[PDB]
Amino acid sequence: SVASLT
Amino acid sequence: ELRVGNRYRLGRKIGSGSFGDIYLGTDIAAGEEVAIKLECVKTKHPQLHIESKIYKMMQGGVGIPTIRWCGAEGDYNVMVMELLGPSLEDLFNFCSRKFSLKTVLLLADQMISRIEYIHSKNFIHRDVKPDNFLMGLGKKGNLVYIIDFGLAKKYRDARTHQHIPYRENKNLTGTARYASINTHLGIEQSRRDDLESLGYVLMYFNLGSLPWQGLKAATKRQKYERISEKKMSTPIEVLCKGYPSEFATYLNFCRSLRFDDKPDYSYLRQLFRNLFHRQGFSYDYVFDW
C-alpha cells in the first residue's frame, strides 16, 4: 500500500 | 575494490524501490558520503536516465539534491546523488509516530514550496509521500528536500505552457495510501494531485495513521479498491475531526481545483502560517526531533 506504482 | 564511475566505492544497501535499489557510497576523492541508485539495464522499461535528466533540470532549486554522476556500468545504469539526512518517515517513526502541530506546520510550509518549485519547472511529481522528503545535512538540517522523480512527468509544454490533455481509464500511479481521489478514479494526474497527496501526508502526521491504512485483503488489486472506497466513503471533515479546520480547508481546496487549474500555493501556505501565528508558535526551526 506504500509501494510505488507505474 | 568495487566502485561505480571509477570514483564511488559502493557500500551497503540502504533502500529499495520499484525503480532501482539505493546504496551508500563513498567518493574516494573527498571521502564524501553519497547515495548510489542502481537500475538493471535488462529492465523492461528504462527510467533512471530520464530521472537523471529531470534532476538536472531542477538543479539549483532550493531543497533539490545535487546529482554528482550519471552513467552506465556493467549490468546497471547508475545515478550518484548527494547524501541527505533522514526522511520524514524516518523522523516520524523516531518520534513514535507523534508530530506536534508546530512541526507539522513548519513542514507543510516547506513542502508546499517544494511542490510549487517542481510545478514551476513544468513537472508533476506524482509520488508525494513521507519517504520522499528528506532533511538536509549540517547547516541545511532545517531544510526539507524532495527526492525521487522516477514517476515524474511534464504536465505542460515548456514553451507554450499548453497543458497535457485530460483522460480517464488510467492505471493507478504512485502509492495507494497517499494518492488523490482523482487517481483512484483513473484520471490523469496534474498539479492538484500532488497537493492533495500532501494533504493526506499532513493528516497522516497529525493522526499517526490514515483510516484506509492496513485494510485486510487478498489479491494486491482488491486491496487497492478497498483503499479507494474507504478513501471515498470517508468525508474530509470526518478524516480531519479533532484538528484545526485549516487541514480540511486545505484538502477541500485541492479537491475543488480543476484538472488544468494553477493552484494558489500562496493561499495554501497562508492558511497554515495564519494558524501558526494563532497558536503562538515561533519560527525557530525547532522540530520535535
Side-chain angles (χ1 to χ4, degrees):
Chain A
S1 59
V2 172
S4 311
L5 310 165
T6 83
Chain B
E1 82 176 344
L2 177 50
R3 299 187 198 153
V4 302
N6 304 288
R7 181 181 173 166
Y8 307 100
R9 184 180 67 196
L10 195 89
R12 86 202 281 149
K13 219 206 51 179
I14 72 199
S16 206
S18 316
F19 287 107
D21 309 285
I22 292 89
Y23 299 74
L24 201 47
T26 307
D27 189 354
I28 64 176
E32 173 195 32
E33 296 295 306
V34 289
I36 297 172
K37 198 155 174 185
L38 298 183
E39 157 182 274
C40 184
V41 306
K42 304 222 201 43
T43 206
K44 208 72 72 154
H45 274 312
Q47 262 247 206
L48 192 66
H49 183 55
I50 293 148
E51 181 174 22
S52 92
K53 309 203 252 233
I54 291 184
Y55 267 116
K56 271 130 180 223
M57 311 218 256
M58 314 264 153
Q59 304 285 95
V62 169
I64 305 283
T66 301
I67 167 161
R68 305 253 195 259
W69 184 87
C70 172
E73 278 237 359
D75 289 347
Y76 294 104
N77 300 307
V78 182
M79 184 176 73
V80 186
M81 294 302 293
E82 138 174 29
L83 183 54
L84 299 167
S87 72
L88 293 187
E89 175 77 12
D90 294 341
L91 290 161
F92 197 45
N93 285 323
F94 178 81
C95 307
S96 292
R97 322 207 109 231
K98 290 203 124 43
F99 273 169
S100 73
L101 184 54
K102 191 187 171 193
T103 282
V104 178
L105 293 186
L106 288 169
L107 296 167
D109 196 60
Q110 284 192 60
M111 293 164 91
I112 296 174
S113 289
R114 306 291 96 93
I115 284 154
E116 168 176 25
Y117 175 83
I118 293 165
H119 291 176
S120 82
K121 290 318 220 194
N122 314 304
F123 281 84
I124 52 185
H125 185 277
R126 305 204 297 167
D127 199 15
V128 171
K129 62 175 167 184
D131 314 71
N132 283 350
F133 296 88
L134 274 47
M135 301 305 302
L137 283 200
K139 304 194 121 223
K140 289 185 170 278
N142 52 339
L143 186 65
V144 176
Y145 287 70
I146 191 159
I147 71 164
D148 193 8
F149 292 78
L151 283 179
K153 73 188 236 200
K154 283 202 167 181
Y155 72 95
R156 77 184 177 179
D157 180 78
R159 218 175 178 255
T160 55
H161 288 0
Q162 174 48 223
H163 203 283
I164 53 171
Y166 180 91
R167 63 154 292 176
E168 296 190 14
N169 313 124
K170 293 213 89 186
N171 288 316
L172 199 179
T173 306
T175 60
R177 190 193 289 176
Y178 304 107
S180 71
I181 302 299
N182 303 127
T183 292
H184 285 290
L185 293 171
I187 294 176
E188 185 73 273
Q189 296 81 27
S190 63
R191 289 177 280 200
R192 60 194 184 160
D193 297 283
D194 286 342
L195 293 176
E196 181 172 334
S197 290
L198 176 63
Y200 299 132
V201 169
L202 299 182
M203 284 302 313
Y204 165 90
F205 287 159
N206 279 328
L207 292 161
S209 70
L210 286 161
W212 46 88
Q213 201 168 321
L215 304 165
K216 197 171 132 232
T219 198
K220 236 357 162 121
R221 124 123 254 74
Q222 123 182 223
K223 209 204 159 60
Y224 295 152
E225 218 67 14
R226 264 292 200 152
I227 288 160
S228 174
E229 300 299 275
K230 177 44 120 152
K231 207 177 256 175
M232 269 182 269
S233 68
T234 299
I236 282 157
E237 288 79 2
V238 164
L239 169 71
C240 301
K241 170 172 198 283
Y243 293 90
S245 64
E246 282 86 347
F247 290 96
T249 305
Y250 177 100
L251 274 166
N252 281 325
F253 180 96
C254 303
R255 291 241 60 236
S256 293
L257 287 161
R258 290 128 93 210
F259 175 68
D260 68 352
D261 285 349
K262 172 186 174 288
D264 192 339
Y265 310 89
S266 320
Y267 168 70
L268 294 173
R269 277 192 300 267
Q270 173 61 30
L271 276 178
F272 292 134
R273 291 168 167 208
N274 181 251
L275 169 67
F276 192 89
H277 289 289
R278 280 168 188 200
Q279 300 308 289
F281 297 153
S282 169
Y283 212 94
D284 50 8
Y285 290 119
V286 169
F287 298 93
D288 300 344
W289 64 83

